[PDB]
């Protein structure tokens, strides 16, 4: 047992309070770098010329932001998709003016979260578990890739990547709607069905299981003490739960099989969110939501507006106002 | 949705934010719980399709809470250990979220909005170089209101001549 | 054509309205398209010199076919709706167009993604099958039960 | 910036009063026998 062997044993050890693992050897430092740079930038970074028009935008707390308005600001449009590490800049001052922190943070974060997914696989294998938790995690991760990498690639600039802040996220969303009509895109619609549905089924499962807990406590103690960690018996009456749910709808919309039930609980939001991610990632190449602008015409040829056309008027508001000093030519082709 | 953004600045409202957290957190719990149970299952049959190896009237848990707890403790740092708490929490998060969003909307009935940050406005009004994502979004909202109101509120008989429409360069 | 001196036209931001410098000095097109200065194409390259776009070539050497092509491409940009309404999202119905590049790019992104998912699926499953626990944890020999407590 | 002058005490008491309520409850729980 030489040093390398012991090192591998420790890295892959099932006894560490936090599993490290080989994916973890990459995850830990990249995530630390991303986090540290993020906290420092969010607190203290000077304003950033996001749209490359020498119009710097302030994102940090010390430069006039609160928690809701603050952001780490996307890198400059003059950079586009160019790689802009610290050492490409003439100075840290330059680097900061141009949104270098954003690139450092999102690249380290994407690497790190990818490795986080890998790591879920890895620990599942060390523990003798089935492997697919990480597949569930691929859905939010794919979403992050969509807004931080794929959409910038499609539009040709990281300046259009989602900003790392609350109001910045809203900005991203509104401009996205202006340019892609994402609300009328079926993949975003499936995404909504996935998170609305996820929420619904969350409450549903929660309340049914809660509602059929077997009596193990008195009135003056929490029902939760009725369950002991590691106990072999199920803590609730799944037959009662099923009976309730089947009478509520009809007998057959209900899941009597807990494995199928829990699989459905995993699958609905995971697939929905996969499609949300694919929505952003294809609208990245400007295949946009449905366009029914002036779709209904009368016998003479007058336009009969539908709600689609009102949506179009709102989108127009967003379009004409966004990045008010950035366009010189009539069409916003990216 | 778009109306509420343009007129109410509804995305800025902390009640809507709590709503969003309850809904997305609900979806998260749904997904993660489902996946966790499905990946800590006991082998209770010989089939490679594991669904058949469950019996409604069985007394035994069909998955290992202990192995699930170790896994999430090592991956994320913390883990459920109480199944009853887990499921109550799954009730609690999206239900609480929706309730908060309802409170925000009740505020909006009265135009009692989270529309602005007054400090931001005082600074921006005095200082034409001060810009944040918040003021950028207000410009988007102003666009929405002006360009959408004539057709969306026909009873007002709005006529907005071209010259008064807010627009950035070129667009 | 209308008489503008495009080399010297200052745009509203202070950057050139038509022409500006890339971050390493090259003369490139102004406006948002500043992000796309890496672009190369046979219709534009004759206007290019050692330092980028050449003001003299621009003033004197732009041919009709170049104008034609620029106009054609500008009006066949790869933007369009799922029901094939050409242009930006706010455009009215009139043109039936979605670029082949959008169709091919989007289709193959979706396919590539789902195939990444398939890779994780069958990789994890193959690992667990070769190790012998793809059908679940053995109740009589649950590995975690023979490991020391985390705390 | 010209912030609301009561924002500070509001935020401080918002944190402290319920946090303290919980700390009291927790500590008196730990000190109970068994």
């Amino acid at each position: 047992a030489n040093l390398w062997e012991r090192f591998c044993n420790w890295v892959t050890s099932t006894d560490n309070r936090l599993y490290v693992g080989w994916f973890g050897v990459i995850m830990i430092p990249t995530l630390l770098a991303a986090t540290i740079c993020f906290v420092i930038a969010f607190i203290a970074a000077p304003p950033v010329d996001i749209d490359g028009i020498r119009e710097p935008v302030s994102g940090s707390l010390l430069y006039g932001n609160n928690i809701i308005t603050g952001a780490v600001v996307p890198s400059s449009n003059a950079i586009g998709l160019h790689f802009y590490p610290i050492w490409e800049a003439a100075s840290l001052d330059e680097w900061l003016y141009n949104g270098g922190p954003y690139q450092l943070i999102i690249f380290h974060f994407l690497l790190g979260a990818s490795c986080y997914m890998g790591r879920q696989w890895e620990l599942s294998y060390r523990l003798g578990m089935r492997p697919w938790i990480c597949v569930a995690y691929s859905a939010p991760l794919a979403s992050a890739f969509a807004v931080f990498l794929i959409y910038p690639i499609g539009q040709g600039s990281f300046s259009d990547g989602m900003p790392l802040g609350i109001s910045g996220t809203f900005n991203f969303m509104i401009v996205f709607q202006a340019e892609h009509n994402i609300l009328m895109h079926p993949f975003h619609q499936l995404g909504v069905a996935g998170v609305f549905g996820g929420a619904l089924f969350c409450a549903m499962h929660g309340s049914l299981v809660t509602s059929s807990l077997i009596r193990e406590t008195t009135e003056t103690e929490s029902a939760n003490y009725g369950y002991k960690f590691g106990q072999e018996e199920e803590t609730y009456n799944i037959v009662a739960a099923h009976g309730y749910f089947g009478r509520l709808i009809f007998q057959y919309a209900s899941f009597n099989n807990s494995r199928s039930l829990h699989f459905f609980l995993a699958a609905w939001p995971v697939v929905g969110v996969w499609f949300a991610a694919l929505g952003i990632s294809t609208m990245a190449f400007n295949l946009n939501g449905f366009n029914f602008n002036h779709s209904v015409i009368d016998a003479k040829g007058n336009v009969i507006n539908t709600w689609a056309d009102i949506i179009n008027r709102a989108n127009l508001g967003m379009e004409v106002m966004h990045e008010r000093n950035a366009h010189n030519f009539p069409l916003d082709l990216a | 949705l778009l109306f509420f953004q343009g007129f109410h600045n509804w995305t800025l409202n902390p009640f809507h934010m709590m709503g969003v957290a309850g809904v997305l957190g609900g979806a998260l719990l749904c997904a993660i719980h489902g996946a966790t149970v499905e990946n800590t299952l006991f082998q209770d049959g010989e089939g490679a399709s594991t669904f058949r190896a469950f019996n409604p009237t069985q007394a035994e848990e069909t998955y290992s809470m202990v192995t699930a707890n170790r896994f999430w403790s090592q991956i994320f740092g913390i883990a459920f250990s109480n199944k009853r708490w887990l499921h109550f929490f799954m009730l609690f998060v999206p239900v609480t979220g929706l309730w908060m969003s309802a409170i925000g909307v009740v505020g909006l009935a009265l135009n009692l909005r989270s529309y602005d940050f007054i400090s931001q406005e005082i600074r921006a009004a005095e200082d034409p170089e001060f810009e944040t994502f918040y003021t950028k979004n207000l410009l988007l909202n102003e666009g929405i209101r002006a360009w959408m109101a004539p057709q969306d509120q026909p009873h007002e008989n709005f006529v907005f001549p071209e010259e008064v429409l807010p627009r950035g360069n070129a667009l | 054509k209308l008489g503008a001196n495009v080399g010297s036209a200052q745009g509203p931001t202070g950057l050139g309205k038509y022409l500006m410098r890339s971050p390493t000095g090259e003369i490139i097109f102004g406006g948002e398209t500043m992000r796309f200065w890496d672009f190369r194409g046979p219709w534009l390259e004759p206007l290019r010199g050692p330092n980028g776009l050449d003001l003299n070539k621009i003033k004197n050497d732009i041919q009709p076919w170049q104008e034609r092509r620029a106009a054609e491409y500008m009006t066949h940009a790869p933007l369009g709706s799922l029901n094939s309404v050409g242009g930006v999202a706010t455009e009215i119905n009139s043109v039936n167009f979605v670029s082949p590049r959008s169709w091919l790019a989007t289709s193959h992104f979706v396919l590539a993604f789902f195939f990444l998912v398939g890779h994780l699926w069958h990789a994890g499953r193959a690992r667990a099958a070769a190790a012998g626990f793809e059908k679940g944890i053995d109740r009589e020999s649950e590995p975690v039960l023979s490991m020391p407590s985390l705390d | 910036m010209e912030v609301n002058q009561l924002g500070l005490i509001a935020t401080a008491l918002f944190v402290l009063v319920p946090s303290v309520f919980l700390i009291i409850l927790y500590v008196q729980t730990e000190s109970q026998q068994k």
Partner: peptide, 30 residues
Amino acid sequence: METITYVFIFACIIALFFFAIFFREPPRIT
């Protein structure tokens, strides 16, 4: 003082992460 408040609250949240992870009540099997 606003900045100090935001950063204070954040810092407390991180501290809480530390205690909730490393000083949790240990799960025990019955």
